Structure formats: structure tokens, C-alpha cells
Amino acid sequence: NSYPGCPSSYDGYCLNGGVCMHIESLDSYTCNCVIGYSGDRCQTRDLRWWELR
């Protein structure tokens, strides 16, 4: 269901990593946040602690 789906405008909408998806139903195009940070879009990044750049 959560297959990789996201037009071009979804290549910088998120400042953090983010995993672009389309999600069934309606649009909802977005980038799944990650482990360590979240919010509108991990805007609340716990800085460097998890991944690496």
C-alpha cells in the first residue's frame, strides 16, 4: 500500500531524510519521517544521534 510515490515537488519538501510515498485513498503525498525525529516532518530533528547526514 505504501509504495514509493511522489511527484517532483517532493524532492525537498522535507529538510530531513524522509521516505516519499503516495498512500492509497487520496493524494497525501509525503515523506515518512524517521527513527529519532518527527513532527510536521522531523522538523524536530534530534540532531545527529541516529543516521549520518
CA distance 18 to 27: 17
For residue 22, what are the contacts with CB-CB under 8 A and spacing of at least 6?
A: 3, 4, 5, 6, 28, 29
- In order of 27, 28, 33, 37, the CA distances from 52 in angstroms are 30, 27, 15, 13
| Residue 41 cell numbers, joined | 516532518
Structure solved using which method? NMR
Q: Which CATH number fits domain 1-53: 2.50.20.10, 3.40.50.12780, 1.20.120.1200, 2.10.25.10?
A: 2.10.25.10
Beta-bridge mates of residue 31: 20
| Residue 6 cell numbers, joined | 511522489
3-state class of 30 per DSSP? Answer: strand
The separation between the first and the last C-alpha atoms of the chain, rounded to the nearest angstrom, is 28
Query: Which amino acid is residue 13, in one-letter code?
Result: Y
Q: What angle do CA 43, 20, 46 make, to 5 degrees?
A: 25
Domain ranges within the chain, ordered by starting residue: 1-53
CA distance 53 to 25: 33
